[PDB]
Design an enzyme around this catalytic site. Structure first.
Site, PDB file in Angstrom:
ATOM      1  N   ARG A 116     -44.708  46.439  68.361  1.00  0.00           N
ATOM      2  CA  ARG A 116     -45.537  47.506  68.642  1.00  0.00           C
ATOM      3  C   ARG A 116     -45.720  47.903  69.895  1.00  0.00           C
ATOM      4  NH1 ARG A 116     -51.792  46.076  69.332  1.00  0.00           N
ATOM      5  NH2 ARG A 116     -52.819  48.193  69.138  1.00  0.00           N
TER       6      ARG A 116
ATOM      7  N   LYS B  88     -55.355  52.561  60.826  1.00  0.00           N
ATOM      8  CA  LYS B  88     -56.195  51.446  61.502  1.00  0.00           C
ATOM      9  C   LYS B  88     -57.819  51.738  61.428  1.00  0.00           C
ATOM     10  CE  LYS B  88     -54.462  50.319  65.589  1.00  0.00           C
ATOM     11  NZ  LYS B  88     -54.377  50.387  66.925  1.00  0.00           N
TER      12      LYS B  88
HETATM   13  N1  ATP Z   1     -47.938  48.403  77.599  1.00  0.00           N
HETATM   14  C1  ATP Z   1     -48.611  47.499  78.195  1.00  0.00           C
HETATM   15  N2  ATP Z   1     -48.543  47.512  79.560  1.00  0.00           N
HETATM   16  C2  ATP Z   1     -49.322  46.446  80.001  1.00  0.00           C
HETATM   17  N3  ATP Z   1     -50.142  45.656  79.509  1.00  0.00           N
HETATM   18  C3  ATP Z   1     -50.094  45.910  78.210  1.00  0.00           C
HETATM   19  C4  ATP Z   1     -49.380  46.698  77.395  1.00  0.00           C
HETATM   20  N4  ATP Z   1     -50.078  46.620  76.234  1.00  0.00           N
HETATM   21  C5  ATP Z   1     -50.710  45.632  75.969  1.00  0.00           C
HETATM   22  N5  ATP Z   1     -50.994  45.138  77.157  1.00  0.00           N
HETATM   23  C6  ATP Z   1     -52.264  44.323  77.515  1.00  0.00           C
HETATM   24  O1  ATP Z   1     -52.302  43.487  76.519  1.00  0.00           O
HETATM   25  C7  ATP Z   1     -53.965  43.672  76.195  1.00  0.00           C
HETATM   26  C8  ATP Z   1     -53.937  43.596  74.437  1.00  0.00           C
HETATM   27  O2  ATP Z   1     -52.894  44.418  74.044  1.00  0.00           O
HETATM   28  P1  ATP Z   1     -53.378  45.438  73.039  1.00  0.00           P
HETATM   29  O3  ATP Z   1     -52.226  46.093  72.540  1.00  0.00           O
HETATM   30  O4  ATP Z   1     -53.985  44.742  71.884  1.00  0.00           O
HETATM   31  O5  ATP Z   1     -54.448  46.358  73.587  1.00  0.00           O
HETATM   32  P2  ATP Z   1     -56.007  46.616  73.531  1.00  0.00           P
HETATM   33  O6  ATP Z   1     -56.470  46.924  74.752  1.00  0.00           O
HETATM   34  O7  ATP Z   1     -56.756  45.432  72.922  1.00  0.00           O
HETATM   35  O8  ATP Z   1     -56.213  47.970  72.734  1.00  0.00           O
HETATM   36  P3  ATP Z   1     -55.883  48.208  71.094  1.00  0.00           P
HETATM   37  O9  ATP Z   1     -57.601  48.093  70.434  1.00  0.00           O
HETATM   38  O10 ATP Z   1     -55.426  49.166  70.783  1.00  0.00           O
HETATM   39  O11 ATP Z   1     -55.350  46.802  70.500  1.00  0.00           O
HETATM   40  C9  ATP Z   1     -54.126  45.198  76.636  1.00  0.00           C
HETATM   41  O12 ATP Z   1     -55.652  45.481  76.765  1.00  0.00           O
HETATM   42  C10 ATP Z   1     -53.344  45.094  78.041  1.00  0.00           C
HETATM   43  O13 ATP Z   1     -53.996  44.415  79.125  1.00  0.00           O
HETATM   44  O1  OXL Z   2     -55.666  46.217  66.999  1.00  0.00           O
HETATM   45  C1  OXL Z   2     -56.197  47.281  67.413  1.00  0.00           C
HETATM   46  O2  OXL Z   2     -55.904  48.435  67.863  1.00  0.00           O
HETATM   47  C2  OXL Z   2     -57.607  46.686  67.452  1.00  0.00           C
HETATM   48  O3  OXL Z   2     -58.092  45.537  66.965  1.00  0.00           O
HETATM   49  O4  OXL Z   2     -58.572  47.741  68.016  1.00  0.00           O
HETATM   50  K     K Z   3     -53.950  51.950  70.868  1.00  0.00           K
HETATM   51 MG    MG Z   4     -57.747  49.637  68.468  1.00  0.00          MG
HETATM   52 MG    MG Z   5     -55.661  44.797  70.984  1.00  0.00          MG
END
Ligand code: ATP
Ligand code: OXL
Ligand code: K
Ligand code: MG
Ligand code: MG
Ligand code: ATP
Ligand code: OXL
Ligand code: OXL
Ligand code: K
Ligand code: K
Ligand code: MG
Ligand code: MG
Ligand code: MG
EC number: 2.7.1.40
Lengths: 519, 519, 519
Positions: C61, C258
C-alpha cells in the site's frame, strides 16, 4: 432401554432421531392426543357410551348431517348420562365434551323418473344436460339432470368438472347458459336420485349457513354444546356468519372451522384468524381436491395451526377398515401416527364409532397409536421451532409457558399442573408442546370440557367451594391434581412436577411456576 | 431502531447475526462482565480505590509475585476501606472481592536498584550477566541480573534464550559459569524488579507448592481473602494441594486455577474439574507457547468453562497500551470485545491498573466494551448450545435456571431476581446466560463478593434482620433488589422482572419463579 | 496425529467447535488470508522488499496522505524490482499487488521541521497553537501546528477537542480566532508529520474527490496500480465519483472503499453495492466513532461483504506493538486471529511496515497467526450459512463453486486448481470458503495480482504461449499448478485435488470439475 423414545429424544438431526426410534422403548401411560368420536347407532347407548369413555373417548361428536333435534338431544342425553356415571369419583371422573357438527351447505340433484329409488346409467363419453328449471326437478334422466343450486352457472366455468355422488360420477362442462350446463360424461355410472354434487375449484356463493344450519346452531346453544364443527368454511366471513348465529348467548362456544375444499385451502389464513380452531375434513377435501394433494393440505394446516397455537383436528378415514375389522390396515396405523407426528391436537373417528362393528376397538386403537407417536416426537427441535415462530411476541403468559415446558424437559417432570379458569394459561402451555401431560384443574366445567381440544391437556374439575385462604385454595387444587395423576398412573410420590399458579386471586395468569415433589 | 442489538438477536444464522450488528443499537446500563483489577502502586491509594469502585472494579487482585506480605495487607486495607466508604447507602453499596495471586513454580528476577518500582532500559546487543549472588538480589541493574532459580544454570546451555517479563526481554546465553551466565540483549526494553523468567522448553523442577506458597496461602487465609488465583497450575493434583493448604479455615475460598503453560493446556480437563474457576493467563502462556496459538487456548478454555458452567477469567494485555495512553488501540478494543463474546465471566487488568498512568480510564474502558459486547452476544444460539451440552443433567436447580432464562428471553425481562445464600441458585442462572442482569440478594457478604466471579450477577447485601414471616422476609429481600435496580437504573416502575425465590425457608434452591412488574 | 483442527471441524455446535480447538493440532502450509503492507520509509528498499515478499507480503500500500508522487513512484519501482527479481523460476515467483491509498476528504497537519520522518514530543498540560499560516506548514513543532483546513475555526468551538493522529493526541480548544486555534495538550505523545485530524462531530464540508485526489487518481492510473483504497467513502456517490475519475483507462482498477466514519458505516450497503470491495479502516473509524463500537462495525461489515461475495480488509493497529517490539501483545494476537475468523479476506499492516523497527517480524507474525486461524474457522456451518444467503441466486458458476467446495471438503482435497483469465470463477470459489488453497492459474498478470484481494487464492501466472489444442493447453496449465503446489509444498504425490476448468475455450466460466491425484 430407555422409555418414551428418550434415546431418540437426544438426537441432533431429524435423520438421527428416526434412526433411533425403538419399538422396545415403552411410552408413558398418559395419552395427550384428544380422541373425537362420532356417536351413532353403534355407540348411542349409555352402556356403550360408558365403554367409549372407558376406552378413551374425550369428545362426542354430533353429526347434524342426519337425524332430528329429538334424536341428537337423545344422544347428548345419553352422553351426559354416561359421563356422570363416574362423577361419584371426583378423582376418577373424566370430562367429556360435546360437539355439533353442521350439515352445512349442500348441492343435491333431483329425482330420477319421479322416483326416489330409480336409477339410470350414465355412459362415459355421453352428453348430459344440467338444468335449473324446476320443471325437471323430478324428471331427471340419462339426458337431463336437475340440481338444487340456483347459482351454479355463475360459479362454474367451461371446462370445469361437476362431480356427482361423492365424486363417483365425474362430468366435464362443455357449454354454459344462465340456466343450464351442457356436460360430457367422463366417469360413468348409475345415477340415483338426490345425489350430492361437488364443484371442484369453484368459489361457491352458497350461504355460510343454511336455513337448517341456523336452526341447528340455536339448538346447539340451547343444548349447551362445547364446540361447533362448522362445515364448508370458505372464508373469514363464513366464520363470522357462524359466530353471529351463535351470538352473545353462545359467545363461549368454540367454533371449529371445517376445511373441505380448495377455497378453504386457499383462504386458510383468514379463516384461521377468524376461527377458534380447525378441522381438516379429509372426506370432502379429498373429493374436492385431488386425492393425492390431501396430505399437503393436511400438513399445511396442521403446521399453521401449531404455529398459531390454535387447536387442530385430523379427521376422516383414519381407521376406515375398522368399520368391519377388529384390527386396522398398515396404512391406517401409519396415518394416525403421522397425524400425531404432524402436530394434530385431536384425531377423529367417524364411521368407525358411529355405525361400525368395532367402535371400542377403533377408540382403543387410536389410543394405542397416539401414545406411541407422542413419544416419538422430536420435542427439542419442535419447541425450538415453535419458539422462533412466536418470537414476535413478548406475552407474559407465553413466557411463563415457555419457561415451564423448558423446565419440564430439563428435569423430565412427570407432569405439569396448571390451575386455570378460563383455560388460557393451560392453553399457552399446550402450544409449547411439553412431553409430559398437562393436568389442568379448573372449577369451570365448560373450560374443562373444552380443554380436550388441546394437546396434552388433562382437565380436572374442582367440585369444592372456595376457601378463605387463596394459598390454601391453590394448595388444595394442586393436591387434587396430585391425587389424580396418582390415581391415573402418571406419576408417583417422589416424582417431580412443574406447578403453575396465579400468585394472587386477581393474578390474571399463572405467573408463578414451581418445581415440586409428588407426595 | 432496536436497542440492545435486538434485531441481530433475531437472526437465524450466525452470519445474519453478524450482519445485523448495529452501532446505533444501544446497550443497557447493567455491565454483566466482572472486572478484575490488579492493585499496586498506581491504584493502592484509598482515594483512587474509591474512584476505582465507582468506575467499575468488582475484584482486587494482589499479586503475590510482587510486594511483601506487608505491602499487600495495607493494600487490602485501603481496599476494604474504600469499599466500606460506600456502606452507608445500602442502595448504592458495592461489594468488592479480594483476590490473592499466587507465586507458584516460577522464576523471578531481583530488585532494580532496591525499588520494587524501579526500572532500567536495556539495549540491543548489550551484554548482561545473570548471577545468583544474593549480594545482588536487590542490586539489579543494566549490567547485573540476579535470579532466584538456583538450578538455572544446568537448566540452560550456551546459545539458549532466556526470557524476561512475559517475553518482553529475550536474552541469549553467551557464556556459562557455575554461579552465573553472560548473556547478550537480543532486543531492547525497560526492566523491572521481580519479573518472571521463562525458559520455554527448559526443564525447571519446581514444586507445585513453594514454602512461600504455603506462606502466602496461609496469609490469604489470615486476610479473609475471597478467592485464590493459583499461578502455573499443571494438574489436578496441584489443585488439591492448594486446597489442602487452605484447609478447613478456607474451605469457602475459591480456587481459580491459572493456565499459563503447555502442561496446563494439556491437562486442562482434570484441572477444570478440580478448580472452582479458571483463568486464562496469557502473559506467561504467551511466551511458554506460540503466540499465534494463544487464541486457540483461550477459546478452547472459555468454551469448556461455560460448557462446564464454571467461571473463567480472560487475563493480561487486554488494554496494555493504556499503561501509558488514555485511549487504547483497535486491537485492544477488539480483544476485550471478543473475549466477552467468547464467553468470559470476567476480564482482567494487570499493569493497566497497578502501575500505568491511566488506571481509571482503563477500568472505564473495559466497562464500555463489556456492555456493548454483551449485547452483541447470540443468546438464542448460545442458550440452545449450552442446553445441549448440559443435557445429561436432570438437575432441579438447572431446570429452574433454564426455565427462568428462557422466560426472561421471551418477555424481555429487565432483570432476574434471585434470593440465595450460598449463591448457588444464582450461579446456576448465570450459567445459562441470560441477556438481563441477575440481581443476587444475599445476607452473606462472602457469597456476595464471590458472585462477581460469574457473568451477570449483581450481588446485593442484605443487612436487615431476619423477618419472622418467611413471605414477608422474602418480600423484604425482593424489594431491596427492586430498589437497587431502580437506583442503578436497571428498570423502572412497570418494568418486568423474573423472581427466583424459595417456597419454604430452607427450600434448598430457588424452587419458585415468578414474573413480576416493577413497583 | 492431529491436524488443521479437523476434530473441531466436526463439532455439531459452535460451542463444541470452540471447545475442541487444539494448540497441538498443526495447520497446513498454505496461508489463505492475503497480507497488505504499507510501504514507507522503513520498507522502501529493494533489499527490504525482497524479504517481505519472502515473508508473506502479497500487496503494497502506497499512502498518498503521505509523501509526494515522486517518493511513491520510486517505491512502486522498488516494489516491482524486488519482485521480478524472483521471475527466474516461475514456480517460486510470487505476484504482488500495488495498492493506491487515497487522500480523500481529510484534514492533515504539516511537516514537522520540514521532515515528515520527523517526530515531536508533546507533554501533558502544555499549550499548542493551531495555525493556518502556511509559513509554518512545513515548520511544525511542539509549539506550532499547522493544518490542511482553512475553515477549521468555523467548524470548532472553544472547549471543543481536536484529535491528532487517529486519536493519539487530544487537544482541547482554549481559544480561537479567525486564523488560528489556541489549545492545551490533554495527553502526552509523539507528534509526527502529515498527521490526521479528527474533529469528531463537526461539520466538515470536504469534497468527496479533491483536485489533488483527482491528481493522485490519475497518477496511479499511470502508475498501473491494481487497486485503490478510497479513503473516507461516505456514500455510493463518492464511489461513482472515484469510479468517474478512474475513467476508462482504469475501468479495471479495483476500487476498495474504506469505511472510516459514522456515515460510511450508516450508508454501508449502497457503498458496498457500488464498490468492488471494502476496508475497515479502524484507525480513523475508531476515533470517528466511539472506540467501544468498532468491533460491531467490523463484524457487521465483514459479515455483509462475505454475504455479498466481495473482498473485505481488516486494517489498522493489528500489530501496533511491533513498531517497537519484536513480539506482539496478547491483544494483538487475538485481533488478527479474530479478524480471520470474522472472515476478512485480507489483513493489513500500517505503521508496522511503513516505519516500524520490525517490519519483517510483523509480517511473518501475520503469516503465522492467519494460518492458525484459517484452520480454526468452522467451515461446515460457515458454508451452510453462506449458502443460506446466496440462495436466491441460481448462477451457474456459483453452482460449480459450491459443488466444488462441497467436494473439496468431503474428500479432503489438497487444493482446488482453477484456470481463469478474468479471475471470476476463482473468486466465486474463494467466496464459498473452502479450507484448501485455490491455485488460480491465469495468463492475466493483473488478474494474478488482484487475486490477493480474495481469500484463499494463490495466483499462478502462466507464461507459456497458447496451445493450438485446448486440451494440451489446459493440461499444461494444470500441470503448472501441480508443479507449483508441489514446490510450495501444498501437496505431494497421490494427493487429491479439485480441478476447475472450462469445457471449451471461451466457456465464460469453469463448467468442468474433476477430482484428481497429484502426479
Ligand atoms: N510514505 C510515507 N512516508 C513516511 N512515513 C510514512 C509514509 N506512509 C506511512 N508513514 C508513516 O506511518 C504512519 C502510519 O502509516 P499509515 O499509512 O497508516 O498512515 P496514517 O497516518 O495512519 O493514515 P491513514 O489513516 O491513511 O492509515 C503514518 O502516520 C506515517 O508517519
Ligand atoms: O487505514 C486507514 O486509513 C485508517 O484506519 O484510517
Ligand atoms: K490515506
Ligand atoms: Mg484512513
Ligand atoms: Mg494508518
Ligand atoms: N504489588 C505490586 N507492587 C509493585 N509492582 C506491582 C505490583 N503488582 C503489580 N506490579 C507491577 O505491575 C506489573 C504487572 O503486574 P502483574 O500482576 O501482571 O505482574 P506480572 O509480573 O506481570 O506477573 P503475573 O504473571 O503473575 O501476572 C508487574 O510486573 C509489576 O511491575
Ligand atoms: O365433513 C367431514 O368431516 C368431511 O368431509 O370429512
Ligand atoms: O499470570 C498471569 O496473569 C499471566 O501470566 O498473564
Ligand atoms: K356434518
Ligand atoms: K503471580
Ligand atoms: Mg364434509
Ligand atoms: Mg502479569
Ligand atoms: Mg503469569
Amino acid at each position: 432401554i430407555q422409555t418414551q423414545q428418550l434415546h431418540a429424544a437426544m438426537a441432533d438431526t431429524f435423520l438421527e432421531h428416526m434412526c433411533r426410534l425403538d419399538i422396545d422403548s415403552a411410552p408413558i401411560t398418559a395419552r395427550n392426543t384428544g380422541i373425537i368420536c362420532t356417536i351413532g347407532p353403534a355407540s348411542r347407548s349409555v352402556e356403550t357410551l360408558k365403554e367409549m369413555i372407558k376406552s378413551g373417548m374425550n369428545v362426542a361428536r354430533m353429526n347434524f348431517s342426519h337425524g332430528t333435534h329429538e334424536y341428537h338431544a337423545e344422544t347428548i342425553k345419553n352422553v351426559r348420562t354416561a359421563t356422570e356415571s363416574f362423577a361419584s369419583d371426583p378423582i376418577l371422573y373424566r370430562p367429556v365434551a360435546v360437539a355439533l357438527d353442521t350439515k352445512g351447505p349442500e348441492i343435491r340433484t333431483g329425482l330420477i323418473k319421479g322416483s326416489g329409488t330409480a336409477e339410470v346409467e350414465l355412459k362415459k363419453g355421453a352428453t348430459l344436460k344440467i338444468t335449473l328449471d324446476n320443471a325437471y326437478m323430478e324428471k331427471c334422466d340419462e339426458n337431463i339432470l336437475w340440481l338444487d343450486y340456483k347459482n351454479i352457472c355463475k360459479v362454474v366455468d367451461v371446462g370445469s368438472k361437476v362431480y356427482v355422488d361423492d365424486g363417483l360420477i365425474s362430468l366435464q362442462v362443455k357449454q354454459k347458459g344462465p340456466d343450464f350446463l351442457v356436460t360430457e360424461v367422463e366417469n360413468g355410472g348409475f345415477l340415483g336420485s338426490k345425489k350430492g354434487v361437488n364443484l371442484p375449484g369453484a368459489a361457491v356463493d352458497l350461504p355460510a349457513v343454511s336455513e337448517k344450519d341456523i336452526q341447528d346452531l340455536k339448538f346447539g346453544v340451547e343444548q349447551d354444546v362445547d364446540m361447533v364443527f362448522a362445515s364448508f368454511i370458505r372464508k373469514a366471513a363464513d366464520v363470522h356468519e357462524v359466530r353471529k348465529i351463535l351470538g352473545e348467548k353462545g359467545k363461549n362456544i368454540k367454533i371449529i372451522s371445517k376445511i373441505e375444499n380448495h377455497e378453504g385451502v386457499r383462504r386458510f389464513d383468514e379463516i384461521l384468524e377468524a376461527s377458534d380452531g380447525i378441522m381438516v375434513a379429509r372426506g370432502d377435501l379429498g373429493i374436492e381436491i385431488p386425492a393425492e394433494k390431501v396430505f399437503l393440505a393436511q400438513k399445511m394446516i396442521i403446521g399453521r395451526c401449531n404455529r398459531a397455537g390454535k387447536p387442530v383436528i385430523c379427521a376422516t378415514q383414519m381407521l376406515e377398515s375398522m368399520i368391519k375389522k377388529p384390527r386396522p390396515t398398515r396404512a391406517e396405523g401409519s396415518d394416525v401416527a403421522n397425524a400425531v407426528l404432524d402436530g394434530a391436537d385431536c384425531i377423529m373417528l367417524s364411521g368407525e364409532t358411529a355405525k361400525g362393528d368395532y367402535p371400542l376397538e377403533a377408540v382403543r386403537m387410536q389410543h394405542l397409536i397416539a401414545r406411541e407417536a407422542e413419544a416419538a416426537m422430536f420435542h427439542r427441535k419442535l419447541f425450538e421451532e415453535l419458539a422462533r415462530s412466536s418470537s414476535h411476541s413478548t406475552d407474559l403468559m407465553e413466557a411463563m409457558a415457555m419457561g415451564s415446558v423448558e423446565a419440564s424437559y430439563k428435569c423430565l417432570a412427570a407432569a405439569l399442573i396448571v390451575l386455570t379458569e378460563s383455560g388460557r394459561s393451560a392453553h399457552q402451555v399446550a402450544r409449547y408442546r411439553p412431553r409430559a401431560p398437562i393436568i389442568a384443574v379448573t372449577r369451570n366445567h365448560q373450560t374443562a370440557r373444552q380443554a380436550h381440544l388441546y394437546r396434552g391437556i388433562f382437565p380436572v374439575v374442582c367440585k369444592d367451594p372456595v376457601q378463605e385462604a387463596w394459598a390454601e385454595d391453590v394448595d388444595l387444587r394442586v393436591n387434587l391434581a396430585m391425587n389424580v395423576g396418582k390415581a391415573r398412573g402418571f406419576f408417583k410420590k417422589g416424582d417431580v412436577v412443574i406447578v403453575l399458579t396465579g400468585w394472587r386471586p386477581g393474578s390474571g395468569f399463572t405467573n408463578t411456576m414451581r418445581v415440586v415433589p409428588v407426595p
